Swiss-Prot record, chain A:
Protein name (Swiss-Prot/TrEMBL): Pre-mRNA-splicing factor 8
Function: Functions as a scaffold that mediates the ordered assembly of spliceosomal proteins and snRNAs. Required for association of BRR2 with the spliceosomal U5 snRNP, and the subsequent assembly of the U4/U6-U5 tri-snRNP complex. Functions as a scaffold that positions spliceosomal U2, U5 and U6 snRNAs at splice sites on pre-mRNA substrates, so that splicing can occur. Interacts with both the 5' and the 3' splice site, as well as the branch region. Has a role in branch site-3' splice site selection. Associates with the branch site-3' splice 3'-exon region. Also has a role in cell cycle.
Origin species: Saccharomyces cerevisiae (strain ATCC 204508 / S288c)
MPN domain boundaries: 1193-1322
Gene Ontology cellular component annotations, sorted alphabetically: catalytic step 2 spliceosome; cytoplasm; nucleus; Prp19 complex; spliceosomal complex; U4/U6 x U5 tri-snRNP complex; U5 snRNP
Gene name tied to this protein: PRP8
Curated annotation (Swiss-Prot), chain B:
Gene: AAR2
Purpose: Component of the U5 snRNP complex that is required for spliceosome assembly and for pre-mRNA splicing. Involved in splicing pre-mRNA of the A1 cistron and other genes that are important for cell growth.
A GO cellular component annotation in the UniProt record: U5 snRNP
Keywords: Cytoplasm, mRNA processing, mRNA splicing, Nucleus, Phosphoprotein
Primary location recorded for the protein, binned into one broad class: cytoplasm
Record region (Leucine-zipper): 245-266
Modified residues (Phosphotyrosine): Y309
GO biological process: spliceosomal snRNP assembly; spliceosomal tri-snRNP complex assembly
Name used for this protein in its record: A1 cistron-splicing factor AAR2
Organism of origin: Saccharomyces cerevisiae (strain ATCC 204508 / S288c)
Post-translational modification: Phosphorylated on serine and tyrosine residues.
Amino acid sequence: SGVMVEWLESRSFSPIPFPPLTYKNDTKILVLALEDLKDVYASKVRLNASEREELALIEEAYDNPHDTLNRIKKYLLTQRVFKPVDITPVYSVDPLEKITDAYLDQYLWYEADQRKLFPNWIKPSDSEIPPLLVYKWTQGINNLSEIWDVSRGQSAVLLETTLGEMAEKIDFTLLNRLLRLIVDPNIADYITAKNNVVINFKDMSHVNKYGLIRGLKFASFIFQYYGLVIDLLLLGQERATDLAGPANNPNEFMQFKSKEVEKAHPIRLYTRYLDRIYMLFHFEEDEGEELTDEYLAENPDPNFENSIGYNNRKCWPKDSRMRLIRQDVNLGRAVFWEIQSRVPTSLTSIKWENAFVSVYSKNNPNLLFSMCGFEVRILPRQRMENDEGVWDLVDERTKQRTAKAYLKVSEEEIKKFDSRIRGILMASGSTTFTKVAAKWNTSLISLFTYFREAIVATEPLLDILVKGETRIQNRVKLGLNSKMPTRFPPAVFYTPKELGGLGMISASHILIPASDLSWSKQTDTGITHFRAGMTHEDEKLIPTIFRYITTWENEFLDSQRVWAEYATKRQEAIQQNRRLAFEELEGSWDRGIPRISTLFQRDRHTLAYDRGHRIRREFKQYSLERNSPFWWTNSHHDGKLWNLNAYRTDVIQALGGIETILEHTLFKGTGFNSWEGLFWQRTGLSQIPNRRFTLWWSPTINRANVYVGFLVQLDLTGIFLHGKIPTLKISLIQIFRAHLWQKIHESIVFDICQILDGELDVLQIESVTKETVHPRKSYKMNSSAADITMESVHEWEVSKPSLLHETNDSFKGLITNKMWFDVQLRYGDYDSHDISRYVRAKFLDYTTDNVSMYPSPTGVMIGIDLAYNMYDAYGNWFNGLKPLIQNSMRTIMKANPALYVLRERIRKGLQIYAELFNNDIKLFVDDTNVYRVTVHKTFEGNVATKAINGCIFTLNPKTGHLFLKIIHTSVWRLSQLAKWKTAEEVSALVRSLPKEEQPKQIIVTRKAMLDPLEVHMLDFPNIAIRPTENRLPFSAAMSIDKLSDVVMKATEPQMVLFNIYDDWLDRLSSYTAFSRLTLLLRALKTNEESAKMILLSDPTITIKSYHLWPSFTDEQWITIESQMRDLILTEYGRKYNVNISALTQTEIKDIILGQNIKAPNEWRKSAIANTLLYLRLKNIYVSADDFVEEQNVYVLPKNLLKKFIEISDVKIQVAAFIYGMSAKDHPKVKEIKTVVLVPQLGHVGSVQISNIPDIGDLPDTEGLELLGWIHTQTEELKFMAASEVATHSKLFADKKRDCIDISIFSTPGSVSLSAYNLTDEGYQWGEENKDIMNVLSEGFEPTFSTHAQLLLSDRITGNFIIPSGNVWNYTFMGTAFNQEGDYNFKYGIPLEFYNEMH
Amino acid sequence: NTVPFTSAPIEVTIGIDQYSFNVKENQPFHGIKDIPIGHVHVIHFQHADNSSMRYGYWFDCRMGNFYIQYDPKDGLYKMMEERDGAKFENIVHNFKERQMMVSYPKIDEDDTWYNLTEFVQMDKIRKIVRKDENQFSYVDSSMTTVQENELLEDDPAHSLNYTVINFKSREAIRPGHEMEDFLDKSYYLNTVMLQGIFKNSSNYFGELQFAFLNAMFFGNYGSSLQWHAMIELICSSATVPKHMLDKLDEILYYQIKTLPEQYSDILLNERVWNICLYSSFQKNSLHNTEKIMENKYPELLGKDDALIYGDDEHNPTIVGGLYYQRP
């Protein structure tokens, strides 16, 4: 109890206060707490009621932060009785209670961290992920002075044991006294009170009289603080103080202040993770022998048995595990017996059974320990008298390797992994194949990302991986067929999900057979094939996870490098009065631990306040039923620590690429030629149901190579079934329903006959006879007959037989009066789908067939593979027949209506621009701007919206017309009602056109329009409604002022119609006209402002009342067009950081692979650019902070800001003065009644500003209290820049001092405000400094500014006084300007920066 | 009552109502007896061969004496009616008397087949499946529906004449009520379908139940479609007769309960089930069905694995705004 008091006194510890009413960080602490709480629900889609209820409660809290804090502190202050806690060990605590608990947890950890309550040796720590801790600890041992020497008979000892039942035996009166030392006692009382509650195991309800409930959100804090008591008992006050270092200046983990104190004590090193203590002792020979004797006294070993029951590390070979020399063994127990004695059985239970003591000595060259699931063996380089998972331990003094650390995965963690896997197979179902593979992948990745190089060295874990992978595959195979396959194509398992594969990741030797690498393509010219050829093993191998994860050592070495680099870069930026820029570090973005990327994330500022986050995450196991396997890293704090995207690419390549992979699937049967990816909370965690998966892969699964001995033919079809594969037979029965097989055959035969009738004269055909054939003939797969018989004006001279695309058949040898056609259908598999080889074999077999009766010897057999959508023909040919059939077959395959049905049916089973300028009159409909709003997010968040006019944008792409219907505001479950209104209007337009002009297609930019518009267009069956893939920038139509103006003014519903093209068709073709138009529009989307500079920038070349665009020349058009053309991509370069690359266009695709970096005076253009600065008003961000009645909010009114930015500039700062008089009955409240434009000098960095204005003459100047100045800037910062500060002294240090700085940030599209309250120390510093032009200057410090409450209203208007002269801007008249002038004033209208005179 | 089998030529799995059993090749199986008289029944076949579709016969014992006989020419078992009672009345007892005939069981606690067929009527069946010569109805896995055939002779008896349901059609949508009728399907349900076609709730339910059973037993595409459509229609209607609503949850519950696991991803329609259960007007009226579905088919409904690797249409378009925030 008092070991803690002496320690806290020695540390001069400052107890944590009850959270103040105006606690600085309250809103941050609260949001972190609540975000933790929400996170459980982030993944899941449908929440049941308790989940659904709890979320409602969080959102309330978050919605009213101020009231919650009140709400919360009341409980901490007063609430000492609490609801029961359910357990299952996982504990469920009442949700309303949790919020207070979580707030409490975040507040304590932040405050304790600030106050250095927990010494460097306590772990887990926010400083490092566990594998990095294990690295640090092994290095730290390496660097102890003279540690590995054994010249003089010295020993080193590493004791590792558990503090048994530490949590379970906590006593509450003790705990309360203990908490009171470090915290407010209203808080100490809540915490212990909160542990004393009823625990409901489902039936029993029992009271928790003692012991810590690890489910409580702040239990982690108790546990570590209570641990510290035990650390102190183990270490004693002095050694603890040596390790920790002085309170004013403390000691980094395992660092000492001087070599002398390091050697001052037997205990060189100490760490606790959390329940587990590690202690490293050094002994000289007597110090050891001496200690062994004291121990051997109380526990003498007459017969030398102390070796039996001495825990050892069995996972190392017998030579590399500790050698049981009697002396070393005895020393081990002695350190244990000494240590054990220092801790009361009340505080914990320490037992020999759960401890491992490793001794390094002249007889033991290996130091062993186990930490965070790694087993570690250190062998010093001297004693080296086995290449896997090795860390080189480098001596910091000598810069040389002095030892090696060897790693393995612990047996206990290998079993955990094996159980996870067995559990996947074990889990109940009925589980989809994809689900099983996902579970496997998660287990695998979880293991690999954590253990990394340790896995390679651990052979039993390697074997378990391999068994596991096989088991996973084998469950999929059993699901597919009761019978186990002879062979199974790895493609089905390892093909990624995007291509319909299970997406398994491999840790095995999986050989891809060469027979699985073949694919084919049908072209207009012919059928063409690929077969594999020669390769080295490992072109034949499914890629494995091993090589895709950087080793911990490499990560750590590289982290040391890059973080040192950043420090250096940080050094210099400061030296040049600059803030360090992202790009400067780009290319170290994804390196380091934490990642360098963490420095530039947005939430960076708030994450600063998240302390205890590593321990917090580890403790979720107690309060959440299902948790992440990545509990050991946090992406917010750490960044992303692995990237496996490469694996996906490499697997696809290893399997033969997209074309080879899809050959195994039914993809070709869809009729699609090209692949582009469209199978079907924001995100998709979607999984393929087995029915679809099995159909997709059927060609490769349902074949003779995979399954034998059970071949049958499916009734009413030519399909063969190679086994009882679940759901496949029905899938195919459905696809061929209504006798489709039979009908396809008949329909194709009919098409052939019709074409032949057209060619009677030209080919000398006397007659074409359609034979009538047995009903089931289409699917007799062993015999056939003629379908069409043909006859002859006179005679035909015919080739011996050759295939439909063989090219010099010669017709001499033969003659006959009669030709026939046989149409054969087949349904192929991966093993067989060579229609060419198939028709030849069939033709040759059947014509010499003594059961197939054909009329003549001459004939042609045509073959279609229904599964693969391929065709070919074989037989005798006469002049001009072959080209007819070729063209014919080519047309029938595309158009035939029966085949179309087969394809549609197949696509349903699977759950699956040049045109635009053709004759068909087609329309585009965009409704993006139909119902549109403006937004007023309060600091709090009941976020209203106001509805402003909108437009239906309907356009004829070919011909450029525009029917704009203005959706007046009157008209208004609202956004949905938008769709139905649009559909109604479009259908009404269409009714008005007569059928000549009615569109044959309407294209909707947005998918949600499809249903409303079909429904409204039922009366127009001939009009297709088609959605699109493209992203089309019509939404940007309201960046066109003529348009925006008509809608916005508009006072009623109207149809106003234009020609967006503007006569370009005059010269230009429609295709192109679009292309400009798209260009014009995408740009505006990108920068409303950058774009419009390009068209008001040369006023003389100008726009007639008729058109929406300047009346440009054609070249400059070619120039204007030229500039934008890059810009789309710049926005691409800037946002994605890609400089230049292959010329692939960007209308439809966001991104693709790099990353090579290949290949090695009337301006007064401004006065334009400042024309367009009202744009920047569309979005205002006012910086905000928690209200206080005592600290007070200033208010600004609209017009004042409206002009101010109106008269502002785009690059150069501008400033003024604000006059405020408190509202009556509102002493706290302040209004910005007047702004005073004053003569000034402005710089991008800085400004020179005239002195406080005398309002004294100018009228009505009366009753007004100055509050301050307000200024613009082009760099956002969170603080007043050095220049701002300099200008703050300069006019407030006296007399008033107090007046605020309002800084405005102008960046295209938005304006961002902030107000700061200057400190005196600021006040002093500037007064030291004049003529500042930089944001950062030596001695400049941000702390000086404080926040002052700010607001913004429509509710008022203010008055502006200009200088009596009317001149305020002296940038171009620097010499005229005197900063110390006396100047007079008048009520007036201000003037823009670039008013003509300035 | 009894259904004799003249022989069992080929190895086949035989189902009657919710029960199934196998017969080996030329095992002496001469039929089923002690069939409860009250119900429509179905007897269905799948050959162990695997060449065959699922096929079967719906019948009513009261309308005739029915027997099964294998047809080698066709290669399947066929139902037939023995017009002469004495001759038929003769065949059993040689088979009952010589045993060789298996007994339909005596009912489980749940009274299951009745719950599945409570509204199904054979005379309605016979108008859906039109083969006027016979008193029993043959259905198999491949049969399309009249709706599908129209929206594209074959034997008209090989088409299922279910009532045509199409949610974007003139019949469903009144001109001048396009949005209203599409978002709330009550007009289509109540006026067009219940008042106009079925005439009764019981008729609507009967078709729905028949469609489900054909979907389950035969894995018939059109049937599954119809079943789901008939469910969707009710759930997507804001106004439904109260007695129908009460009834529906029970109807669906038994169907889902009786569904064996293997036929689930074949039958069930992800979209429709998630709509009806979680966003439809009548979602609350399906308490029991929701519970069983969540238990039997959680994956279909979204119940729970990590990211390995590493819109706004339903919101207004934002012109511009006023925002209070940190940075």
